[PDB]
Design an enzyme around this catalytic site. Structure first.
Site, short mmCIF file in Angstrom:
data_model
loop_
_atom_site.label_atom_id
_atom_site.label_comp_id
_atom_site.label_asym_id
_atom_site.label_seq_id
_atom_site.Cartn_x
_atom_site.Cartn_y
_atom_site.Cartn_z
N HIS A 75 0.82 -1.22 0.00
CA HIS A 75 0.00 0.00 0.00
C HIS A 75 0.86 1.27 0.00
O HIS A 75 1.07 1.90 1.04
CB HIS A 75 -0.99 0.00 1.18
CG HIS A 75 -2.12 -0.97 1.02
ND1 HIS A 75 -2.27 -2.07 1.83
CD2 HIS A 75 -3.14 -1.01 0.13
CE1 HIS A 75 -3.35 -2.74 1.46
NE2 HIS A 75 -3.89 -2.12 0.43
N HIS A 79 1.05 1.30 -5.91
CA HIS A 79 -0.22 0.57 -5.96
C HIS A 79 -1.33 1.40 -6.61
O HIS A 79 -2.02 0.92 -7.50
CB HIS A 79 -0.66 0.12 -4.57
CG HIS A 79 -2.00 -0.55 -4.55
ND1 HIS A 79 -2.28 -1.65 -5.33
CD2 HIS A 79 -3.14 -0.25 -3.88
CE1 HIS A 79 -3.53 -2.01 -5.13
NE2 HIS A 79 -4.07 -1.18 -4.26
N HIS A 115 -7.64 6.37 -3.25
CA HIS A 115 -8.36 5.30 -2.51
C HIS A 115 -7.62 4.66 -1.32
O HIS A 115 -8.28 4.10 -0.45
CB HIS A 115 -8.88 4.20 -3.47
CG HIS A 115 -7.83 3.24 -3.94
ND1 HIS A 115 -6.91 3.57 -4.92
CD2 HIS A 115 -7.56 1.97 -3.58
CE1 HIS A 115 -6.12 2.53 -5.13
NE2 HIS A 115 -6.49 1.55 -4.33
N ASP A 116 -6.29 4.73 -1.30
CA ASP A 116 -5.49 4.24 -0.16
C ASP A 116 -4.47 5.28 0.34
O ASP A 116 -3.36 4.93 0.74
CB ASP A 116 -4.76 2.94 -0.55
CG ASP A 116 -5.69 1.74 -0.67
OD1 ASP A 116 -6.64 1.61 0.13
OD2 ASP A 116 -5.45 0.90 -1.56
N1 LIG Z 1 -3.13 -10.87 -4.35
C1 LIG Z 1 -3.63 -10.47 -3.17
N2 LIG Z 1 -3.74 -11.41 -2.20
C2 LIG Z 1 -4.24 -11.01 -1.04
CL1 LIG Z 1 -4.36 -12.25 0.17
N3 LIG Z 1 -4.67 -9.82 -0.64
C3 LIG Z 1 -4.53 -8.92 -1.62
C4 LIG Z 1 -4.03 -9.15 -2.89
N4 LIG Z 1 -4.03 -7.99 -3.64
C5 LIG Z 1 -4.52 -7.09 -2.82
N5 LIG Z 1 -4.85 -7.58 -1.59
C6 LIG Z 1 -5.42 -6.85 -0.46
C7 LIG Z 1 -6.80 -7.33 -0.11
C8 LIG Z 1 -7.82 -7.29 -1.05
C9 LIG Z 1 -9.05 -7.84 -0.72
O1 LIG Z 1 -9.93 -7.80 -1.77
C10 LIG Z 1 -11.22 -8.41 -1.63
C11 LIG Z 1 -11.69 -8.48 -3.13
F1 LIG Z 1 -11.68 -7.24 -3.69
F2 LIG Z 1 -10.82 -9.22 -3.86
C12 LIG Z 1 -9.24 -8.39 0.54
C13 LIG Z 1 -8.17 -8.36 1.42
N6 LIG Z 1 -6.97 -7.85 1.12
MG LIG Z 2 -8.08 0.08 1.20
ZN LIG Z 3 -6.36 -0.62 -2.39
#
Ligand SMILES: Nc1nc(Cl)nc2c1ncn2Cc1cc(OCC(F)F)ccn1
Ligand SMILES: [Mg+2]
Ligand SMILES: [Zn+2]
Length: 338
Positions: A75, A79, A115-116
């Protein structure tokens, strides 16, 4: 305008899905959002719509990108540049252009940028359990998501030079403000299946019914009128920001692996701190001493990504993303070797 050569070369084929965001990260010295933002905002023509100078836009991208934590693995400024690239790609598709309005295009690109903003490399659950300043400020309810949008408007409208929303009509800004806030809040984890199911039930299932009739001229206007309503446009925007935010599994193989390593490393930092302080371990599977990254991505893709991008693909038509999703899913399966 007068951009240096390596950063100019890095942003060559930016309309294409295959894009070296990490070359742009290395070239810009952890300042990819300002350079990519300037080109993307100029290509769509944001400051022509908003009525602002290039100096007003640069100061807005400067102060926003500064508040992104470079110390975070995932983050950070890079990103949001990648999410801004994903957003711009979806906006450029034939389905989204004819469905959404120019005000929605501007709302999407601005939302993707902020957004972040000021992400502390920690989840909402960490802040609530730890009792952080923002958890108390936002009452354990969309703690990060509300902070991202709020702080973005604080930095924009607080300073006169940074305010891109300076020369606008009160109604146009009020509509655009609500649009940006909605998309930033829609990225929250807890509201995932709510936003996905509403996209299937309100857009895809009605659209599948009407497409079965035929390709009649009168039938296209019924499809156009239905999709272009304020309610359905919001649901498309909610789906577009959600897919763009987690588009990393649908990237080329080498970029997919890099994004997975960063977000995994970020969770291990949180897990070590939670055990040290004596907090409740919300992500026990994501510990550096026990976590299989390949298997964790297979779990992540099957639970959230597969069904979301399936619905999004049905609407927009995204052959490149789903081909990358298949290749990357099979790559993680190959790395087991047992
Ligand atoms: N490749 C990824 N794997 C994982 Cl384990 N988490 C990720 C990823 N890329 C962004 N994130 C953050 C996130 C994203 C999230 O998204 C929910 C849905 F939008 F996919 C839920 C919780 N953490
Ligand atoms: Mg967020
Ligand atoms: Zn994000």
């Amino acid at each position: 305008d007068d951009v240096p050569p390596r950063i100019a070369r890095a942003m060559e084929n930016e309309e294409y899905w295959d894009f070296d965001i990490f070359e742009l990260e290395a070239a810009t010295h952890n300042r990819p959002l300002i350079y990519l933002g300037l080109k993307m905002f100029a290509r769509f023509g944001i400051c022509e719509f908003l009525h602002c100078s290039e100096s007003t836009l640069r100061s807005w991208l400067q102060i926003i990108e500064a508040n992104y934590h470079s110390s975070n693995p995932y983050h950070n400024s890079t990103h949001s540049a990648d999410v801004l690239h994903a957003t711009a790609y979806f906006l450029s598709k034939e389905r989204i252009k004819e469905t959404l309005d120019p005000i929605d295009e501007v709302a999407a690109l601005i939302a993707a940028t902020i957004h972040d903003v000021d992400h502390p490399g920690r989840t909402n659950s960490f802040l609530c359990n730890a009792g952080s300043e923002l958890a108390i400020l936002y009452n354990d309810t969309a703690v990060l998501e509300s902070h991202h949008a709020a702080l973005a408007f604080q930095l924009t409208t607080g300073d006169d030079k940074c305010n891109i929303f300076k020369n606008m009509e009160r109604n146009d800004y009020r509509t655009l403000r609500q649009g940006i806030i909605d998309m930033v809040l829609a990225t929250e984890m807890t509201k995932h299946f709510e936003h996905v199911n509403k996209f299937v039930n309100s857009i895809n299932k009605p659209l599948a019914t009407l497409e079965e009739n035929g390709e009649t001229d009168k039938n296209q206007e019924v499809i156009n009128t239905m999709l272009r309503t304020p309610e359905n446009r919001t649901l498309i925007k909610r789906m577009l920001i959600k897919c763009a935010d987690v588009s990393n599994p649908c990237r080329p193989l080498q970029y997919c692996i890099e994004w997975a390593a960063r977000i995994s490393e970020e969770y291990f930092s949180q897990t070590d701190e939670e055990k040290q302080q004596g907090l409740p371990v919300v992500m026990p599977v994501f510990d550096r001493n026990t976590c299989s990254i390949p298997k964790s991505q297979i779990s992540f893709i099957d639970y959230f990504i597969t069904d979301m991008f399936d619905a999004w693909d049905a609407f927009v038509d995204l052959p490149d993303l789903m081909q990358h999703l298949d290749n990357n899913f099979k790559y993680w399966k190959g790395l087991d070797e047992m």
